Design a protein around this ligand. Structure first.
Ligand SMILES: Cc1[nH]ncc1-c1cc2nc(CN3CCCC3)[nH]c(=O)c2s1
Length: 396
């Protein structure tokens, strides 16, 4: 009992689209689509529409069954909360079936909608899923329920560079290492056509062996064909943010990847001096000092810093037009600050890190400080609060 052939040449084009993992219409995305449509229609008021009631009668049963079968939060044991953003918490979890340990980031759907900002998490997902770089925290799974986005990542038990800097006086030998690793990480992000915009020590995590990976790509943007972005997109606390990005908040200015090299300058200063170069008691105080960097930047005479370290910091902390890294990473790598006997640029990540964490087990979270509501209103009309999250689901 065979079919008469037609729509075979479409079935091949479609199976190709569906099987591409970086395609908007893979199978997980089409399932997200049906799940989201049911969540946004199943309210008592909307169901007085016959079209909606008929559709939900036909699909609500099979959609609850599917939700049972696909990856969910209940599949993980929460060992401990190791971070709490405004977005949601980061949890040290163990997958029940495999007994493997991960970090799981929760993003509140309600918080992203309520504060008009529900598109930043796409680049985070895509960088961590597809970077395939030793310098980028790896995404294994992304899934969602009606309340949360979940991202399951490799656990980084070394903690962040904030925690390191507050536990050690960092000598130049160490500062060389971490600065070099940050420069290679950012070069990897830039090579994928992205600028970070808010590089800080909180975004720099250490792995089991004490080597650096970038996490938190919430602020990342694709460069256009010219290597620039022309936007006014909002950033948070200004301590590590470049003048050109701070100015762009006032309305569309232009910046490129050299804004990330500014941040390396601030980082290197903080490591060697013990405070950020434009620290003030208020946000507006820090903003003011950053815009006035030509005057406001000065090293304490009591900090005592090599000629080469001071030269590199000052080469980063200038206007974008003349900033070190404007002409590519090559001129950064050949800066004399990075001359050393311990590592080369080609092999740094397989040399001994300055701080190798002492871990007792696979759930040791001693390099993280301790840590111990909210909904969508029931709509009267279709508003599609689940529509922005169609295509988030991803399985390695
Ligand atoms: C993948 C991983 N393994 N072990 C820990 C982590 C992460 C920790 C974390 N923490 C934050 C919080 N933000 C940092 C800058 C402002 C708040 N954000 C993230 O994406 C991750 S990933």
């Amino acid at each position: 009992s065979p079919g008469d052939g037609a729509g075979a040449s479409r079935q091949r084009k479609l199976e190709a689209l569906i099987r591409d993992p970086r395609s908007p219409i893979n199978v997980e995305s089409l399932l997200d689509g049906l799940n989201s449509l049911v969540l946004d229609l199943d309210f008592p008021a909307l169901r007085k529409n016959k079209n909606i009631d008929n559709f939900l009668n036909r699909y609500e049963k099979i959609v609850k069954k599917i939700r049972g079968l696909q990856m969910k939060a209940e599949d993980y044991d929460v060992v401990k909360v190791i971070g709490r953003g405004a977005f949601g918490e980061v949890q040290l979890v163990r997958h029940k079936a495999s007994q493997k340990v991960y970090a799981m980031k929760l993003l509140s759907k309600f918080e992203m909608i309520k504060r008009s900002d529900s598109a930043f998490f796409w680049e985070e997902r895509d960088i961590m899923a597809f970077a395939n770089s030793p310098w980028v925290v790896q995404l294994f799974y992304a899934f969602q329920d009606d309340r949360y986005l979940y991202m399951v990542m490799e656990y980084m038990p070394g903690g962040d560079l904030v925690n390191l800097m507050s536990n050690y006086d960092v000598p130049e030998k160490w500062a060389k290492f971490y600065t070099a690793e940050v420069v290679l990480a950012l070069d990897a992000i830039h090579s994928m056509g992205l600028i970070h915009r808010d590089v800080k020590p909180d975004n720099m995590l250490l792995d089991k062996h004490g080597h650096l990976k970038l996490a938190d790509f919430g602020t990342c943007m694709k460069m256009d064909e010219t290597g620039m972005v022309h936007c006014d997109t909002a950033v948070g606390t200004p301590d590590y943010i470049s003048p050109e990005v701070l100015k762009s908040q006032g309305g569309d200015g232009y910046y490129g990847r050299e804004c990330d090299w500014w941040s390396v300058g601030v980082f290197l200063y903080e490591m060697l001096v013990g405070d950020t170069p434009f620290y003030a008691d208020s946000l507006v105080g820090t903003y003011s000092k950053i815009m006035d960097h030509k005057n406001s930047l000065c090293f304490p005479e009591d900090a005592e810093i090599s000629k080469h370290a001071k030269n590199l910091i000052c080469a980063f902390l200038t206007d974008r037009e003349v900033r070190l890294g404007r002409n590519g990473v090559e001129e950064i790598r050949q800066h004399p600050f990075f001359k050393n006997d311990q590592w080369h640029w080609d092999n740094i990540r397989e040399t001994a890190a300055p701080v190798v964490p002492e871990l007792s087990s696979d759930i040791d979270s001693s390099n993280f400080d301790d840590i111990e509501v909210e909904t969508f209103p029931i709509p009267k009309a279709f508003v599609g609060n689940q529509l922005p999250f169609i295509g988030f689901t991803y399985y390695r």
